[PDB]
Design a protein around this ligand. Structure first.
Ligand SMILES: Nc1nc2c(ncn2[C@@H]2O[C@H](COP(=O)(O)OP(=O)(O)O)[C@@H](O)[C@H]2O)c(=O)[nH]1
Length: 258
């Protein structure tokens, strides 16, 4: 019925949560022809929902096979929803992947895990103000104390590709936004409308996998090269770095509440 994808940074509490949600309704196996573990399973309480676990990754780079597995699954549109496990204690760095996940076009829910530790240190997070400015639902969870779990799985199940109409994509500096829009318009119907922005930013970044597994015309390829060149001249920096700078700048802007 409903396909929810669990993903986040290594040691954010993925396995911990995954175990509490699925119980022993788990199946361990293979991603095709890749030396990467594949596990999935039914939600213990709502048996019509299935959770597909994804590799612990810091970002959708084209290098490690763990990230090719994650990129491919989330762009296959098999998942109805993305349940993002975020470490509360290292909130800033965790959101880096989050911004990339949102761009896939599959609705993202944040399980702000390890909320118990946050209290011990003294640091606080405004869950309401964070959620709104980030544009995604945020449910504080603790895999230790076992709080927020059922509340986040419920949120995830109701935040799907068939429920969500308006998807707030992280808006960056106008100069980069001009480029994304220029790449998008040129792409036309060559990319899935949902994943359009993911592919657009990946083409700007000059991503190996995206370019290779996309049959773009001579006209399209030339136009995308021009846009990249001029944007590099405007920012006086390479395309990969403009995007990295823009993600963190957005992350600090969102942390105007935290
Ligand atoms: N205090 C606290 N610890 C947690 C919580 N969730 C996970 N952990 C701890 O995080 C460590 C790694 O958990 P794990 O699920 O393997 O992280 P993963 O690599 O994302 O799967 C373990 O030692 C857990 O005790 C939590 O909500 N609160």
């Amino acid at each position: 019925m409903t396909e929810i994808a669990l993903i986040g940074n290594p040691n954010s509490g993925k396995t911990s949560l995954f175990n509490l949600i699925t119980g022993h309704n788990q199946r361990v196996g293979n991603w095709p022809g890749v030396t990467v573990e594949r596990k999935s399973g039914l939600v213990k309480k709502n048996k019509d929902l299935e959770i597909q676990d994804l590799p612990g990754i810091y970002s959708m780079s084209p290098y490690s096979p763990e990230e090719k597995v994650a990129r491919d699954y989330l762009l296959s549109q098999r998942a109805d929803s993305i349940l993002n496990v975020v470490d509360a204690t290292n909130l800033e760095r965790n959101l880096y992947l989050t911004t990339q996940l949102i761009e896939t076009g599959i609705p993202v829910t944040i399980a702000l895990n390890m909320i118990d530790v946050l209290d011990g240190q003294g640091k606080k997070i405004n869950v309401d103000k964070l959620s709104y400015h980030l544009g995604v639902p945020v449910v504080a969870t603790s895999a230790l104390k076992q709080t927020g779990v059922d509340q986040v799985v419920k949120k995830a199940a109701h935040t799907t590709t068939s429920t969500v109409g308006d998807l707030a994509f992280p808006i960056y500096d106008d100069r980069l936004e001009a480029a994304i829009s220029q790449i998008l318009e040129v792409l036309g119907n060559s990319v899935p409308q949902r994943s359009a922005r993911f592919y657009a930013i990946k083409l700007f970044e000059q991503d190996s996998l995206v370019e290779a597994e996309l049959d773009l015309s001579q006209f399209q390829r030339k136009e995308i090269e021009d846009i990249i060149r001029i944007t590099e001249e405007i920012f006086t920096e390479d395309a990969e770095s403009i995007v990295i700078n823009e993600r963190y700048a957005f992350i600090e802007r969102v942390c105007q509440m935290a």
